[PDB]
Amino acid sequence: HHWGYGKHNGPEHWHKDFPIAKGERQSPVDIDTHTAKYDPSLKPLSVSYDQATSLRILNNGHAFNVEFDDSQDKAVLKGGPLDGTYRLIQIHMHVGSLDGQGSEHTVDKKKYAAELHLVHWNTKYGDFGKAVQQPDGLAVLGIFLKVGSAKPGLQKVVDVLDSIKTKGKSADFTNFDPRGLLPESLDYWTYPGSLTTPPLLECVTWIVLKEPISVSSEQVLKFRKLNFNGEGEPEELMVDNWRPAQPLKNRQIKASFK
Ligand SMILES: [Co+2]
């Protein structure tokens, strides 16, 4: 079998195949707002998704993933704690089975209904594959999801979920603007971490937005209708595909806001 989120292959088994799962810079972590350090020396975050170019959306059996053309600097992330340019390559979602869970990062132990991960990689490394092998190769943008008013930017994804219900299924997803997935405020917390799924490489500079985005009940409901399984196998709803919080160790979490 493969790694996953089930009893016999979930986050608790990962360390056997990827020993780094027990490393010193593992993600996600809990964000204790009473001890996070405000650092007024962080250049403002710069999100430039003006010429963004999405390609397709896919169900790899772990989540839905929207792939982007990262051959050029069309949709990048700079500023904040980042040095250089980071190219957006993919966006996926971690969701729960209940509104009270689903996010990977937590704030004062509170879990959100879901967490969006916008994955970017350092252009000083040539490509994603080379980037994941560097302590500062990736820059992932995390956005918490909370039930409220429907998010138009997410409705685009919601409307195609039917076509990619099972593992391995993919659909064309061009003309998708990721700007519609952001909240109003760009305030964030940041700390050095890793990928949250195998190979769990400690190559990412985490940027987690303080302000979640709102999604309607109908939308969140549709985001839980996807399947972990491939067509024809016993149906396993793709819910609770999140890795719990990991030991922060001596890492310091910094806030961009007072
Ligand atoms: Co993720």
How far is Cα 57 from Cα 52, in angstroms, rounded to an integer? 15
Any alpha helices (H) in the chain, and if so which ranges?
Answer: 128-131, 152-158, 217-223
Q: Is 117 annotated as a binding residue?
A: yes
Q: Give distance in angstroms: CA of 197 to centre of ligand 1.
A: 7
Give SS3 for 229. coil
How far is Cα 171 from Cα 253, in angstroms, rounded to an integer? 38
CATH number, domain at 24? Answer: 3.10.200.10
Q: Is 15 annotated as a binding residue?
A: no
Experimental approach was X-ray
Decide if 62 is catalytic: yes
Structure tokens at 22: 């027990």
Q: Resolution in A for the shown PDB structure?
A: 2.0
Range of the domain at 64: 1-258
Residue 116 makes CB contacts below 8 A (sequence gap 6+) with 91, 92, 93, 141, 142, 143, 144, 145, 181, 213
Residue tagged 């001596």 (tokens): 250
Give SS3 for 231. coil
Q: Give distance in angstroms: CA of 135 to centre of ligand 1.
A: 17
Q: Residue 162 to residues 90, 119, 158, 176: CA-CA distances in angstroms?
A: 20, 24, 8, 17
Buried b (16+ CB within 10 A) or exposed e, 96-125: beeeebbbbbbbeeebbbbbbbbbbbbbeb
Q: Give distance in angstroms: CA of 186 to centre of ligand 1.
A: 19
Active-site position among 13, 62, 105, 120: 62
C-alpha angle 135/248/119, rounded to 5°?
45
State phi, psi for 88 to the nearest 5 degrees: -70, 125
Number of domains in the chain: 1
Q: Give distance in angstroms: CA of 248 to centre of ligand 1.
A: 18
